[PDB]
Design an enzyme around this catalytic site. Structure first.
Site, PDB file in Angstrom:
ATOM      1  N   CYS A 106       0.815  -1.219   0.000  1.00 28.44           N
ATOM      2  CA  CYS A 106       0.000   0.000   0.000  1.00 28.44           C
ATOM      3  C   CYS A 106       0.847   1.267   0.000  1.00 28.44           C
ATOM      4  O   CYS A 106       1.584   1.514   0.959  1.00 28.44           O
ATOM      5  CB  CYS A 106      -0.943   0.019   1.222  1.00 28.44           C
ATOM      6  N   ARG A 109       0.076   4.546   2.929  1.00 27.30           N
ATOM      7  CA  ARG A 109       0.156   4.309   4.366  1.00 27.30           C
ATOM      8  C   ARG A 109       0.570   5.504   5.248  1.00 27.30           C
ATOM      9  O   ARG A 109       0.572   5.388   6.476  1.00 27.30           O
ATOM     10  CB  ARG A 109       1.044   3.095   4.668  1.00 27.30           C
ATOM     11  N   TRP A 278      -9.129   6.613  -0.487  1.00 26.04           N
ATOM     12  CA  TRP A 278      -9.460   7.346  -1.705  1.00 26.04           C
ATOM     13  C   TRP A 278      -8.477   6.933  -2.798  1.00 26.04           C
ATOM     14  O   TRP A 278      -7.399   6.405  -2.507  1.00 26.04           O
ATOM     15  CB  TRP A 278      -9.394   8.853  -1.486  1.00 26.04           C
ATOM     16  N   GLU A 283      -4.922   4.126 -10.734  1.00 25.86           N
ATOM     17  CA  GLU A 283      -5.750   2.950 -10.500  1.00 25.86           C
ATOM     18  C   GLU A 283      -6.892   2.887 -11.513  1.00 25.86           C
ATOM     19  O   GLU A 283      -7.128   1.853 -12.151  1.00 25.86           O
ATOM     20  CB  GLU A 283      -6.320   2.977  -9.087  1.00 25.86           C
TER      21      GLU A 283
HETATM   22  C1  HEM Z   1      -6.361   6.702   1.901  1.00 24.41           C
HETATM   23  C2  HEM Z   1      -5.696   6.598   0.746  1.00 24.41           C
HETATM   24  C3  HEM Z   1      -5.176   5.256   0.164  1.00 24.41           C
HETATM   25  C4  HEM Z   1      -4.466   5.191  -0.966  1.00 24.41           C
HETATM   26  C5  HEM Z   1      -4.058   6.410  -1.832  1.00 24.41           C
HETATM   27  C6  HEM Z   1      -4.155   3.803  -1.233  1.00 24.41           C
HETATM   28  C7  HEM Z   1      -3.438   3.335  -2.313  1.00 24.41           C
HETATM   29  C8  HEM Z   1      -3.272   2.009  -2.640  1.00 24.41           C
HETATM   30  C9  HEM Z   1      -2.924   1.472  -3.946  1.00 24.41           C
HETATM   31  C10 HEM Z   1      -2.682   2.276  -5.246  1.00 24.41           C
HETATM   32  C11 HEM Z   1      -2.843   0.145  -3.832  1.00 24.41           C
HETATM   33  C12 HEM Z   1      -2.538  -0.839  -4.975  1.00 24.41           C
HETATM   34  C13 HEM Z   1      -3.911  -1.460  -5.239  1.00 24.41           C
HETATM   35  C14 HEM Z   1      -4.006  -2.027  -6.622  1.00 24.41           C
HETATM   36  O1  HEM Z   1      -3.083  -1.755  -7.439  1.00 24.41           O
HETATM   37  O2  HEM Z   1      -5.011  -2.743  -6.887  1.00 24.41           O
HETATM   38  C15 HEM Z   1      -3.145  -0.215  -2.463  1.00 24.41           C
HETATM   39  C16 HEM Z   1      -3.157  -1.487  -1.939  1.00 24.41           C
HETATM   40  C17 HEM Z   1      -3.535  -1.832  -0.656  1.00 24.41           C
HETATM   41  N1  HEM Z   1      -4.067  -0.993   0.322  1.00 24.41           N
HETATM   42 FE1  HEM Z   1      -4.000   1.080   0.266  1.00 24.41          FE
HETATM   43  N2  HEM Z   1      -4.701   3.031  -0.215  1.00 24.41           N
HETATM   44  C18 HEM Z   1      -5.342   3.889   0.665  1.00 24.41           C
HETATM   45  C19 HEM Z   1      -6.028   3.480   1.799  1.00 24.41           C
HETATM   46  C20 HEM Z   1      -5.978   2.233   2.396  1.00 24.41           C
HETATM   47  C21 HEM Z   1      -6.633   1.832   3.636  1.00 24.41           C
HETATM   48  C22 HEM Z   1      -7.544   2.758   4.489  1.00 24.41           C
HETATM   49  C23 HEM Z   1      -6.320   0.539   3.852  1.00 24.41           C
HETATM   50  C24 HEM Z   1      -6.722  -0.379   5.033  1.00 24.41           C
HETATM   51  C25 HEM Z   1      -7.238   0.088   6.174  1.00 24.41           C
HETATM   52  C26 HEM Z   1      -5.448   0.093   2.773  1.00 24.41           C
HETATM   53  C27 HEM Z   1      -4.893  -1.163   2.644  1.00 24.41           C
HETATM   54  C28 HEM Z   1      -4.342  -1.698   1.501  1.00 24.41           C
HETATM   55  C29 HEM Z   1      -3.961  -3.083   1.330  1.00 24.41           C
HETATM   56  C30 HEM Z   1      -4.060  -4.256   2.344  1.00 24.41           C
HETATM   57  C31 HEM Z   1      -3.415  -3.155  -0.096  1.00 24.41           C
HETATM   58  C32 HEM Z   1      -2.892  -4.412  -0.796  1.00 24.41           C
HETATM   59  C33 HEM Z   1      -4.146  -5.159  -1.211  1.00 24.41           C
HETATM   60  C34 HEM Z   1      -3.711  -6.271  -2.101  1.00 24.41           C
HETATM   61  O3  HEM Z   1      -2.619  -6.838  -1.816  1.00 24.41           O
HETATM   62  O4  HEM Z   1      -4.447  -6.574  -3.083  1.00 24.41           O
HETATM   63  N3  HEM Z   1      -5.281   1.142   1.912  1.00 24.41           N
HETATM   64  N4  HEM Z   1      -3.398   0.948  -1.765  1.00 24.41           N
HETATM   65  C1  LIG Z   2      -8.584   1.174   0.380  1.00 24.40           C
HETATM   66  C2  LIG Z   2      -8.085   1.377  -1.037  1.00 24.40           C
HETATM   67  C3  LIG Z   2      -7.602   2.603  -1.497  1.00 24.40           C
HETATM   68  C4  LIG Z   2      -7.152   2.712  -2.826  1.00 24.40           C
HETATM   69  N1  LIG Z   2      -6.680   3.871  -3.350  1.00 24.40           N
HETATM   70  N2  LIG Z   2      -7.196   1.649  -3.647  1.00 24.40           N
HETATM   71  C5  LIG Z   2      -7.634   0.453  -3.212  1.00 24.40           C
HETATM   72  C6  LIG Z   2      -7.692  -0.702  -4.175  1.00 24.40           C
HETATM   73  C7  LIG Z   2      -9.085  -0.447  -4.730  1.00 24.40           C
HETATM   74  C8  LIG Z   2      -9.516  -1.470  -5.744  1.00 24.40           C
HETATM   75  C9  LIG Z   2     -10.759  -1.347  -6.359  1.00 24.40           C
HETATM   76  C10 LIG Z   2     -11.158  -2.292  -7.297  1.00 24.40           C
HETATM   77  F1  LIG Z   2     -12.358  -2.165  -7.889  1.00 24.40           F
HETATM   78  C11 LIG Z   2     -10.310  -3.360  -7.619  1.00 24.40           C
HETATM   79  C12 LIG Z   2      -9.060  -3.475  -6.999  1.00 24.40           C
HETATM   80  C13 LIG Z   2      -8.077  -4.593  -7.281  1.00 24.40           C
HETATM   81  C14 LIG Z   2      -8.702  -5.809  -7.954  1.00 24.40           C
HETATM   82  C15 LIG Z   2      -7.893  -7.057  -7.600  1.00 24.40           C
HETATM   83  N3  LIG Z   2      -6.472  -6.885  -7.944  1.00 24.40           N
HETATM   84  C16 LIG Z   2      -5.641  -7.678  -7.027  1.00 24.40           C
HETATM   85  C17 LIG Z   2      -6.257  -7.346  -9.319  1.00 24.40           C
HETATM   86  C18 LIG Z   2      -8.674  -2.526  -6.062  1.00 24.40           C
HETATM   87  C19 LIG Z   2      -8.102   0.305  -1.915  1.00 24.40           C
END
Ligand code: HEM
Ligand SMILES: Cc1cc(N)nc(CCc2cc(F)cc(CCCN(C)C)c2)c1
Ligand code: HEM
Ligand SMILES: Cc1cc(N)nc(CCc2cc(F)cc(CCCN(C)C)c2)c1
Ligand SMILES: C[C@H](O)[C@H](O)[C@H]1CNc2nc(N)[nH]c(=O)c2N1
Ligand SMILES: C[C@H](O)[C@H](O)[C@H]1CNc2nc(N)[nH]c(=O)c2N1
Ligand SMILES: [Zn+2]
Lengths: 407, 411
Positions: A106, A109, A278, A283
């Site tokens: 993420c 963070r 957000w 994305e």
């Molecule tokens: C608030 C602004 C946030 C931004 C800008 C953000 C951004 C991102 C992005 C760009 C990814 C890559 C996801 C993808 O490519 O599909 C990601 C993954 C992830 N985010 Fe964050 N996120 C945010 C909030 C959060 C919150 C609130 C949580 C949990 C409480 C979180 C937990 C995670 C986790 C566990 C992943 C990895 C999920 C996976 O492995 O598929 N994120 N985030």
């Molecule tokens: C909490 C949060 C914030 C943020 N900026 N972006 C995310 C991911 C949101 C998301 C939204 C979504 F529609 C699909 C995915 C990933 C689909 C499965 N992957 C492993 C191929 C992710 C989650």
């Protein structure tokens, strides 16, 4: 045993000590790196509880306190009696925030400590789950001024009474296979969409149909619910130069909300724990719109721009990619929906790493996921060495419910 | 054991068996992935098994495994090792070895070409002057007036570590960098330290933005000597843009021949510390990294200004927009001047096909995703969506310490 990471742009070197606290495994070995692979009882429970309570009580400067020892004893006594244990609200909130803190994939963070935790452990039914989720959605959306949140349903008991949100994300567009052989809407969601229909959804066979929720309580059969449309904030996509862009008919939803993961805290397992923050612009604009196995609009956009699409070397794909991502950011900003561009977000993350190294001794990070899917090396994270390791509490992947469910 | 990789765009699944032949370490453990970390005198004891492992591979590849020729060769090498403490590769083994080091290079996207490599045997070389001659010839052959040909020149192997052949230049052709008293940099900031060494060693610096560095060549562990590559052998390309006429006035150019000269070639336990090799450029190497890294020529601002992009907020994506135009310009210039170059779309698409072919014919293709994915437009290239397994096979190319840090000066 004390590891150094170098930033090759700035020469700044950080020293990681935190990885020594790591407990879960990576998939990698001394002979093979799996860094680019996307998906690599009572006796078990108490050390996990202890491990957690130690870090909790350390965090509040009460390590080796009577309150610490007492809690440790209380939890220990509760596991012996009941096989499991219940978290205090304070522990739950700490655990969820740290699961986010420890999410090595993420980029967002820096915000980890500002998370609204909704305790939904009193939930008993799917209708209740729906209510809790509507409330989460409304709170997090906040009329476009987004706020990070997680809603946490009851913890796993015997694995036969799991709470599950069947949707991969709270808000997503349906997917339909045409007799034309093509695909209408989001190709990623075709199979889930069929499960909705098979379970009774009346699909409107459109291109941007917000899916219904499929909610499972207490290991029972899942049920369908429709999120109130007025709670789903969407953004029509226009470009700030190309008037024609609006004719493409593109929109996206404002709230990214992951609902399929497993929250592990102190050995306890939360199978239903939807969370939201957000979007980072790429994305939607790079992955959702331009991925070949997604909406895959590159060709249409390029034509509207009248690019030479004869030879890859004209970089017409790259040019369109930029403009698409320009439009996304412009459209969210214009409608005052929170969004962050990949430059801002990766810049924030570098600052976050430096804070974490300085205040925690490290920050686990997955470079493969942290570097944005466009313009990688013009973002500072590209040049940043990162150590990837597994800390707990954590968000984990888990199997889709339809494969697991004794119907 | 079997290992699956999945392509997430196509659902194509491949099965790796080749990783079972892996020897060297990754840096990773079950507790830590070091996948984004950039960086990580031998006894008769360990040498023969390394020789034997290699010779077994070689004879299998020519379908003579277990043959009398194979057995006599093992015999001959073993004796030469216990007698002389090392051994000499036959020409055939040297060529096989060099090709396979390239074939095994997990960070190289261009490996579809691995079987077409011109190997120049420079093992009879004895002096820095001789090295210079060999390197000029390599440059002339490889350049081929713009129709670039991959080549490698192999100088004598290490003996005691006190008589190493080394090319001190990290790349055969590169631009000087100069630090100014005001702290600004003229030329290529990456090359400041090395430029300073060259100057100290007696090089007369023209002090411009694109001065081709002299060669600093070390033979047989002696002090390095300076040589100027004949300018007529250094093919360069003025950078212009197909639609933006002001782009030429940025005053940019680059050289056509990418040639890495600071690495070490290991074949059958032997160490070739001087083995410059060359191919042709993928456009992003120049247009993204060389021109646009903050730590390099760093032209994003100037380009963005001339395009009159909104530069007050990053959300305009002015940097991304300028970056594309620069890269179009690099490709356009090279093509217009008929100097071989490949775009990141072509190259990654070719790599996927190569990778799949390697899986079928070889049982795997070690690949480092962090390096393979191009530094712009990552996910609209097919490698982004390709799961990859990274492991180390020999023969191989390895990093070695910079010679100015290890050299014992004779004076
Ligand atoms: C608030 C602004 C946030 C931004 C800008 C953000 C951004 C991102 C992005 C760009 C990814 C890559 C996801 C993808 O490519 O599909 C990601 C993954 C992830 N985010 Fe964050 N996120 C945010 C909030 C959060 C919150 C609130 C949580 C949990 C409480 C979180 C937990 C995670 C986790 C566990 C992943 C990895 C999920 C996976 O492995 O598929 N994120 N985030
Ligand atoms: C909490 C949060 C914030 C943020 N900026 N972006 C995310 C991911 C949101 C998301 C939204 C979504 F529609 C699909 C995915 C990933 C689909 C499965 N992957 C492993 C191929 C992710 C989650
Ligand atoms: C012929 C066309 C070739 C192309 C298009 C190509 C492409 C590339 C690129 C883009 C990189 C990354 C470079 C960087 O980011 O600094 C690379 C790395 C590498 N290439 Fe190739 N290459 C080619 C030929 C060769 C040849 C002939 C050899 C050796 C015989 C070779 C061996 C390597 C090695 C060992 C690396 C890793 C370098 C390192 O770790 O610093 N390549 N290649
Ligand atoms: C043989 C070959 C073909 C090809 N297309 N590209 C290359 C690399 C060329 C190159 C040329 C060069 F001048 C510098 C570098 C990278 C320097 C080390 N990094 C970590 C800062 C690389 C080599
Ligand atoms: C195969 C490869 O691991 C896969 O394409 C990954 C690469 N990096 C990624 N990074 C992010 N942030 N999101 C992704 O879905 C992916 N996909
Ligand atoms: C820290 C990180 O490993 C480093 O910036 C790497 C990333 N991937 C790369 N990939 C290529 N091809 N070349 C590079 O120099 C780098 N640098
Ligand atoms: Zn690894």
């Amino acid at each position: 045993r004390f590891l150094k990471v170098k930033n090759w742009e700035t020469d700044v070197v950080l020293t990681d000590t935190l990885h020594l606290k790591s407990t879960l495994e990576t998939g990698c070995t001394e002979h093979i790196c799996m860094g680019s692979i996307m998906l690599p009882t009572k006796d078990q429970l108490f050390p996990l509880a202890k491990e957690f309570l130690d870090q909790y009580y350390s965090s509040i400067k009460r390590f080796g306190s009577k309150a610490h020892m007492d809690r440790l004893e209380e939890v220990n006594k509760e596991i012996e009696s009941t096989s499991t244990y219940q978290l205090k609200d304070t522990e739950l909130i700490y655990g969820a925030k740290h699961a986010w803190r420890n999410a090595s994939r993420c980029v967002g963070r820096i915000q980890w400590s500002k998370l609204q935790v909704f305790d939904a452990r009193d939930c008993t039914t799917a209708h209740g789950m729906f209510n809790y989720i509507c409330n989460h959605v409304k709170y997090a959306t906040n009329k476009g001024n987004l706020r990070s949140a997680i809603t946490i349903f009851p913890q796993r008991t015997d694995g036969k009474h799991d709470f599950r949100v069947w949707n991969s994300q709270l808000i997503r567009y349906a997917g339909y296979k045409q007799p034309d052989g093509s695909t209408l809407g989001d190709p990623a969601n075709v199979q889930f969409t069929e499960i909705c229909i098979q379970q009774g959804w009346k699909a409107p066979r459109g291109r941007f149909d917000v899916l219904p929720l499929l909610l499972q309580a207490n290991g029972n059969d899942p049920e369908l619910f429709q999120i109130p449309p007025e709670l789903v904030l969407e953004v029509p996509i226009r470009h700030p130069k190309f008037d024609w862009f609006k004719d493409l008919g593109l929109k996206w939803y404002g709230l990214p909300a992951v609902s399929n993961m497993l929250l592990e805290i102190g050995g306890l397992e939360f199978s239903a724990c939807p969370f939201s923050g957000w979007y980072m612009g790429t994305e939607i604009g790079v992955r959702d719109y331009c991925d070949n196995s997604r909406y895959n609009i590159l060709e249409e956009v390029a034509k509207k721009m009248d690019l030479d699409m004869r030879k890859t070397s004209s970089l017409w794909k790259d040019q369109a990619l930029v403009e698409i991502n320009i439009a996304v950011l412009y459209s969210f900003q214009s409608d005052k929906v929170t969004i962050v561009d990949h430059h801002s977000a990766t810049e924030s993350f570098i600052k976050h790493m430096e804070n974490e190294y300085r205040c925690r001794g490290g920050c686990p990070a997955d470079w493969v996921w942290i570097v944005p899917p466009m313009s990688g090396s013009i973002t500072p994270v590209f040049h940043q060495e990162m150590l990837n390791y597994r800390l707990t509490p954590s968000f984990e992947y888990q199997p889709d419910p339809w494969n697991t469910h004794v119907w």
